[PDB]
Design a protein around this ligand. Sequence first.
Ligand code: HEM
Ligand code: HEM
Ligand SMILES: [Ca+2]
Ligand SMILES: [Ca+2]
Ligand SMILES: [Ca+2]
Ligand SMILES: [Ca+2]
Ligand SMILES: [Ca+2]
Ligand SMILES: [Ca+2]
Lengths: 679, 677, 359
Amino acid sequence: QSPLAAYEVDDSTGYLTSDVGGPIQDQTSLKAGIRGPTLLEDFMFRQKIQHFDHERVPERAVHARGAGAHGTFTSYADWSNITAASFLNATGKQTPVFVRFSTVAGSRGSADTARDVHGFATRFYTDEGNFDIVGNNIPVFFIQDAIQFPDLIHSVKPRPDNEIPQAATAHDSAWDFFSQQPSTMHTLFWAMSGHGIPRSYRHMDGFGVHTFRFVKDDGSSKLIKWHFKSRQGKASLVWEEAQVLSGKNADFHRQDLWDAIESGNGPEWDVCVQIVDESQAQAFGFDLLDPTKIIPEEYAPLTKLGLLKLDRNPTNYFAETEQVMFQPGHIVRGIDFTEDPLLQGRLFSYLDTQLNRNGGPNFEQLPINMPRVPIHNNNRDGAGQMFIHRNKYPYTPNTLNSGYPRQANQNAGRGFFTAPGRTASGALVREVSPTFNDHWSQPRLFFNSLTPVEQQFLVNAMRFAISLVKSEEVKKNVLTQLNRVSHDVAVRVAAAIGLGAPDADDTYYHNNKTAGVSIVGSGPLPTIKTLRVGILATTSESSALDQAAQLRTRLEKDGLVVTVVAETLREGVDQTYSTADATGFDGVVVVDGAAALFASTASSPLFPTGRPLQIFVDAYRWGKPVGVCGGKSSEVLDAADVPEDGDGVYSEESVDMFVEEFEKGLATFRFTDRFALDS
Amino acid sequence: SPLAAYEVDDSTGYLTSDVGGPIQDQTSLKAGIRGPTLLEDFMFRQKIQHFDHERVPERAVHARGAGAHGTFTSYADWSNITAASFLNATGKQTPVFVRFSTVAGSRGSADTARDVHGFATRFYTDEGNFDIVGNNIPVFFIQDAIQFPDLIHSVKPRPDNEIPQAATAHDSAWDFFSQQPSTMHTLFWAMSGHGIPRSYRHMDGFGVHTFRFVKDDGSSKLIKWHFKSRQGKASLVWEEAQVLSGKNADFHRQDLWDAIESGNGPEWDVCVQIVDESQAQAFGFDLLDPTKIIPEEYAPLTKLGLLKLDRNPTNYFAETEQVMFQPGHIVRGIDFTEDPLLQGRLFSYLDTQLNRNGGPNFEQLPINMPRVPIHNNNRDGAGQMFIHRNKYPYTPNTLNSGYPRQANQNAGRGFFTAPGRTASGALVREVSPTFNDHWSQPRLFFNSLTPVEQQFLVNAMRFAISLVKSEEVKKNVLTQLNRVSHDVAVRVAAAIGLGAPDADDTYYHNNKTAGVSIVGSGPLPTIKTLRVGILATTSESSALDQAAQLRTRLEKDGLVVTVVAETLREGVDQTYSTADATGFDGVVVVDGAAALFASTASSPLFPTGRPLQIFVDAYRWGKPVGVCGGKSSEVLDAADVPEDGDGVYSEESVDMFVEEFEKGLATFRFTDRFALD
Amino acid sequence: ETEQVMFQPGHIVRGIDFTEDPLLQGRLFSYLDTQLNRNGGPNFEQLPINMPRVPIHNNNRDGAGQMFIHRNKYPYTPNTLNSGYPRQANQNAGRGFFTAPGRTASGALVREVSPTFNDHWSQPRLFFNSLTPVEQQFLVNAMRFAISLVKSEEVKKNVLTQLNRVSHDVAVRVAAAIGLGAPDADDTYYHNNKTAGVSIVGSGPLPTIKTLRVGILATTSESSALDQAAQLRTRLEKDGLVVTVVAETLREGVDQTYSTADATGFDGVVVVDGAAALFASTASSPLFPTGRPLQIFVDAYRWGKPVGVCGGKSSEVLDAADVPEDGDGVYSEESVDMFVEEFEKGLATFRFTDRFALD
Ligand code: HEM
Ligand code: HEM
Ligand SMILES: [Ca+2]
Ligand SMILES: [Ca+2]
Ligand SMILES: [Ca+2]
Ligand SMILES: [Ca+2]
Ligand SMILES: [Ca+2]
Ligand SMILES: [Ca+2]
């Protein structure tokens, strides 16, 4: 009775039919003789190849690369005291959800592990209509006015003469826009942090970005920010790992999410708001209409409203994930917009762009887009009309259908209503509020709030990206804008590109910090379930496979995903060295029984030269917990040049001691002492 | 410049709407300075509507690709074999556009996937557009076009989760291959170096199908198209291709774009095998079967002319994305064959452009327009650009004096079906038994590779099949491989912990054919455009001096030189942080930089061990590597590279270094560095 | 339902097959293709009106507006991973469609017309011979009307050349209206053969008069005219005729005003004699155009319809206001029962063809 159940098609049995139920074959063309030309009258051929010919639809203009899952939202309380929203109106109230995660710049097929902003779009199929929160993993946006979105996106997408390159943040046009449009600095700093390369969709947060309104039935309103706070904790890749992972497994994030749901480890978020009074719009030292600013948690704490859990994978990716069409216009009674000029223009874009993707106006009829309550309106006809409307008088006002459907409003049929306190006053202007003009304080706040090695990673990400800018003018302009946020950042970045930084300009410099934005500083992960352990073994020593089988039992107990790697497959071995890479693991364990594979002179026609040692060395250099289990453990760490007294290096004869130490390393997740800092 | 009439210049002027009204586009119109946005803001809505509607559907296959403009030059008057006007005079020039592609990946997927590749050529001929829509592999997976969706569904990502984008590395692909043995020949090509070509410039193009050449006298001959690279044939190694897919997803489009901008526009000899109609079933297989090659030993290549790509697009979307190729774009002098794969394609490419273009006037797009007049009674349709003067667009008419006139064999240089063509028999959905040998030609191909090449193909199969979860699919795969070669089945089986079935010698043989080996095609005929990375340091003025000296002598011979160091300055192209061995065809270390290669070396400016990793990766992937300056053993010992190794260079003299190294770049890969079973 | 219904000759079932009719052959392509235009996407068979009433089992997927959620994640043949489903249907399994096995093709691949198609004129002449004399006049008259609106003298000459090959008599009679000479007879394709079942005029009386439309022209002037109209309505509605009572103004038992009424609205027209006064020169009123009541009667008579006057007073510059009382399909009775019994025969005759002039 859910529109998805009714539309499920089972092909587990039966004879092949046309789309109109006529049994057919589809394996040989109809020909004038056994070596003859194909006949036009072969309808079986044409219906099949026409469908194939038309399978593709336009990719999303942005966030083209992504993956979705089904789940549930459960309210923690009756939130009537702050909003009329029905999905929040009772303790334990459950609403089905669909979520799609994404990058922003890359086309379909682009790697998940690009450095990019990420999408986090949540549909609540509420009992008063579909409500979408179309958010990002970063709480601030590049630009202050929706009319600028094509300029931003044209600048970060590939240069349009050759469609090169697919590196959003690593070409001239992107840094030209960033340096010419200083609003971009706050999101740029977030994108150059580990938030640009999250470990998974499950290990990042969701943000509505915009200030919205909570509207009560009495018509009063408060200003809110949405925060979806991950229960898996926060985690990043390191860049040099992200680049290899983009080649070895372009599907890493979609596969991570799919596997977590299949294993009963469906990811969870606390859905939260900051709530402040209308009178505080300009009280925090910036404008709450400005989507380049966060409200520091010290000024306004998070309230937990409910639990978001994703626990079911799609049946058909195309029908569900590709076709889901989100809109901030999908709003419900008890929520209202703000005069954020970015949000304001979004409302137009998402209704319009679905005409491009769907090719017709009836996109809300696709099962994934349908609501879970009756539809009563006078919308008619259009390509792909799937309803048969009984009301032959679809106009208001009518007597011939007894005045149905009835208007809904603040006082009728639980209508949506605009927050009745809202006003507008002044000239009809194309002018930016001077309250929006501080582009550099919050980037500085964010930078101050990261740990020293985290600041190094961000500087290194900028050194990497800006070094690939060919224009000396663009590079100069970039250092000018970076210098307004932090002289130190402009100096350290200028060092990698052989330019002089501008002289300190302390206009926007400050020492303030804010909790909750650091990944490095966010402490050990609250759970290690789903984390990936590579056990490097060998088929040559039956001791090595026993060591591996004993580590496997002890690690699988704690919900770790264990891969035993050997030269060849056999029972208890999951993967060959040939297909194995350190990007596939959160921690790597060598069984000392396999010590001979790590020799400088080790060679095999079954995997590339040096593969076993490369996995262990890559894992170590990328900051992961690594260890040798067995007794000649000290022996093998020398081959690797991996110091046995190293933080996050494990060397035990006992399996139980090895795992107990190693599992703490997985929770630590990254050993940041292995990364050099500027002097 | 061939599309110069459609070009729009925005180097000067004030922003306008699409209807030439000067406007702004940086701030929304609002009811007050902190007000909501007005619906009456047409500047906002026209700009965002355009943005909202930028995207068109990607191609159903070959979504990932890149294109360039060029010229075709005929070597001769080919009247004696074909009426084709573009081939009718020595030196006759015809503009071309080519698009290269992979097959399975979506439009943002890495260039260096393991896959079949497309090679589509449009000839804008003086008798209409002629398209050869070819691949870099001369045989196709399937014998009947009706099977194409089965093939493409099986190789594309699993439709519940759209995982994985590794076309040849999931259960569904190997399920199809093992149940549809026609796939074996193309599969063996895709598992060879032909699946990971070094560039578009270093692969051939093939029409795959037998076509006909038809003379003005109506007589016909059967032909195959072969576009033979003048750059020579080259592959990546898999271990390299995987890293390159992450470090530079754009590697093949950038290689082509750079080659054209540097005046190194790639060249192909456009060739044909020509055989008689009487030889359709004479070579031990059916020329209508697209899973079979004519061995060059049976029918030699005739060179018809030169294809040169020498001009990049102005707008990628308008030119490369919007180019709509069709095998139905045929000219007088060419005809089809009863190849059931070709027959169905003729339907598919006319139909699929309705999907991409969203309307029927896709031939009116600048890139799709012909360079000669259009005279027909096609009318109206969404996006009609033409304003037709003829108000009587019907035949037969008197009110337009019977224009346009019907063109045929005898009048108006009409296209005509080869008049010797017949059909005879039952109307059947039956496969010709002449198509039934799926395994001999796969064995021919395998037999025709060098021992190291054979190892690479076994290794590609071991990699891919080891990722198949189904034990029943892996067994069915070994049953099909075993019918091509027991040795291949045993070597693959060893990787996956299964027994190969007993030898089945029905199709086994020791025949070989020339021209299908990459390793066997000898040194490259040119090293121009090949990439030399010079690893230096800013910490030693003399390291930079060595690098500048090496640059001057390498650039003289047309090599693309990248000097790498810790930081950028005059004469340093890239930092260690952005550098990778996938970036170079050879790596040189200047001995002044030897300190960077110590196990102890550490910098906040690049990842731990990056300088030595570039050297070791380059060595391990078979590239020419060396140390210039005389002090070589610190670098070579840190790398575990032997000084006496083939393609390992150590010279004090820059001149002697470069002469040796340039020989290495021609050899291109040192195959003695790969282990054999 | 109606606008979105998407018909195809390629919608065929086991037990039916095509022929090599080159018109049919090309239709098979057109109707699958044209639905992409109308629907804007490839899933037009999923529209309710186009859906079948039996299960769909196939590997068609995706496309704009995809409504199905397919469970089968291995939509290729041949497969083992979905156990080889869906299975191939053919002559010997799963009730597959199959091409008629006796069908063959032989010869050159040709863009040539079969000479067996070349007689374009015998069958036109067969059709023309099979029409009644008045029916032949109607057809001549339709050609005179249409060809008289052609401006090109050359096209008009070419038309008489082709019509002449069917019938010299047709070419002569059409030529007379357009001021041209018919070309000399050409008897290559002339014949006197006839076939049953193609004539309308010759197909005899209608097998039922249910739904046929009777306009009763009355007046609000005379409560007796409204009483006549009411008794006529009761007696006509009993036999399933659709009755419209017409008067100057609406009220109980009046369906339409003279202002909206027209002879095209009726298969038969009855005037109640209580309304005789409206059928005179006098007949001016701000409630309908001058002459409207009589025009409905005169139009109905001129177009061959059964017409009459019920109540017994028929002459009263009523019929005399135009038409003959002895006319076939002209009725005059005082008795409502006798009037209706005569009138219903006239509705079954449907058209009185003796009212049209012949060449
Ligand atoms: C706070 C700023 C923004 C955020 C957080 C944001 C977030 C997103 C997300 C998550 C998606 C992908 C939804 C999915 O998975 O299907 C998306 C798609 C899109 N966004 Fe935004 N966006 C922002 C600003 C804008 C602006 C200013 C515009 C245009 C003026 C815009 C236009 C679009 C369009 C056209 C799409 C494709 C929508 C579709 O095809 O369904 N976005 N955005
Ligand atoms: C010998 C076998 C084949 C070869 C060599 C071949 C080659 C190609 C190439 C090179 C392209 C990309 C053209 C471009 O760059 O725009 C392409 C696209 C395509 N091919 Fe084929 N193909 C083959 C068989 C088939 C078959 C059997 C079908 C269908 C029955 C088919 C349907 C298509 C479609 C629908 C596209 C997208 C075309 C477009 O969007 O313009 N191909 N093919
Ligand atoms: Ca650029
Ligand atoms: Ca980080
Ligand atoms: Ca309102
Ligand atoms: Ca699969
Ligand atoms: Ca090779
Ligand atoms: Ca459309």
